[PDB]
Structures are given as C-alpha cells and as structure tokens.
Design a protein around this ligand. Structure first.
Ligand SMILES: NC(=[NH2+])c1ccc2[nH]c(-c3cccc(-c4ccccc4)c3[O-])cc2c1
Ligand SMILES: [Ca+2]
Ligand SMILES: [Cl-]
Length: 223
C-alpha cells in the first residue's frame, strides 16, 4: 500500500496473508472455512495465515491453516485478468473471535464515490520496493466508469472497477494482490492490477465482487 497508514493490530480481522514460506498475496475470510483472493495469486502449497499484524513475528492471535483446495474461476483469463477471483477452502475451520472475523459479501454493487478501505502487506514505494512488517491501510474511493476507461482504454471489462487517486501518491501495489476492498462493511473488490503503483492517472483496478456473489454461493454450496 503506497501512501496509506498503519492499520493497528487486528483492526482488519478478515484480512489473511497467503503464505508459501513468504507472503505473496492477501485474501479475505468470508466464512470460517473459505477465503476469497485473486485468481492470479494461485499456486500450490498455500498456507493461509489469519489474525496477523506483523507477518514476520508470532505475536499471538495467529492461526495458520493449510488450504484444502483453491478454485480459480473457470473463465479466468491470465492475459486480461478478467474474472480474477479465486476461492480457497481451508483444511479445518478457523476459530472466529474479535481478531479473526469474516466479512460479508455485498447484495448490490457500489457506486462511484463510495469510500472503501484497502489493506495489505505490499510494497509501500512506487519507485522501488519496501515491504512492511505490519498491515497497511488506505481509504480510497471508487471512480466512475468513464474515468476508469479513460485511464485504461480497452482493458477494463464489466468485472473490474477503478478505485484510488488520479493525482497519484496513494494506491495498492505488489504484495497487496488478492486482498480486500471493503465499503460499508461489504467486500466490494479484490486487489487485482494497476500500471506501476501510485502513478498519476493510473488508478488501481479491482475485481468487481458484486458480479460473482451467486457464483461464490453456488460454488461453496457444492464443495
Ligand atoms: N498498482 C496497483 N494498484 C497494483 C495492485 C496489485 C498489484 N499486484 C501487482 C503484482 C506485481 C507483480 C507480481 C504480482 C503477483 C504475481 C503472481 C502472484 C502473486 C502476485 C502482483 O500481484 C502489482 C500490482 C499493482
Ligand atoms: Ca505475526
Ligand atoms: Cl474502452
């Protein structure tokens, strides 16, 4: 997260770190046995780490659970990143409490202007790599479809939305992919891609979760 602030330990209880010996992506806990992340974060050997703040220190509240299966959306396109969503089923359910909680899926899509919270352990520099130990947060608004399409002509599908600041300075970045974009208590997006990080007129692009709720529900109900 570039231009954000330190969240404060366990203030984002639905945030998870996907780990394979190092942190490579974020994700969101939506119930006690399922996590939603981005399809491009898929790999084998995933350990899901819940209740984290400093990802390099066991401070207490952590729960490390292996993924039993990861379900990449069947129409995921790795060239356009269209349908960049994945569901991960945990080997055992997690113990929910005030430090580990799930986030609700939305019933409707959000409108431009909506203020959301984006978080993660990704790079905090736009020009260079500085990875934090604790979780960073950024409050950012959803942009209108026209500004998004004018920024990325021909690359935005109906399953994506832009959020951020066109003046540059604040954005999600590498290491944040797969994580949450929460607006009014509902998970509206998943960190997907962007051109550089925090560059002028190149906002972050997110997977539009409201378009996949029936798919998430039906898939979880059958697995
Ligand atoms: N400007 C943004 N808003 C933004 C958001 C998420 C991002 N993720 C990345 C990213 C960069 C290199 C590798 C990965 C990656 C690749 C495979 C698996 C996991 C992460 C990224 O997600 C860049 C990147 C940029
Ligand atoms: Ca820790
Ligand atoms: Cl277009």
């Amino acid at each position: 997260i570039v231009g954000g602030y330190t969240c404060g330990a366990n203030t984002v209880p639905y945030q998870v770190s996907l780990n394979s010996g190092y942190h490579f992506c974020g994700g969101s806990l939506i119930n006690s046995q399922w996590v939603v992340s981005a399809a491009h974060c898929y790999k084998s050997g995933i350990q899901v780490r819940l209740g984290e703040d400093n990802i390099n220190v066991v401070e207490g509240n952590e729960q490390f659970i292996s993924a039993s299966k990861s379900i990449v959306h069947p129409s995921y396109n790795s060239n356009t990143l269209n349908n960049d969503i994945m569901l991960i089923k945990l080997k055992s359910a997690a113990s929910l409490n005030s430090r580990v909680a799930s986030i609700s899926l939305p019933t409707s899509c959000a409108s431009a202007g909506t203020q959301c919270l984006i978080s993660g352990w990704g790079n905090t520099k736009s020009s260079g790599t500085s990875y934090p130990d604790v979780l960073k947060c950024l409050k950012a608004p959803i942009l209108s479809d026209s500004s998004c399409k004018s920024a990325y002509p021909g690359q935005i599908t109906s399953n994506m939305f832009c959020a951020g600041y066109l003046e540059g300075g604040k954005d999600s970045c590498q290491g944040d992919s797969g994580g949450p974009v929460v607006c009014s208590g509902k998970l509206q997006g998943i960190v997907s891609w962007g051109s550089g990080c925090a560059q002028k007129n190149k906002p972050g692009v997110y997977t539009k979760v409201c378009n996949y709720v029936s798919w998430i529900k039906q898939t979880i109900a059958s697995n």
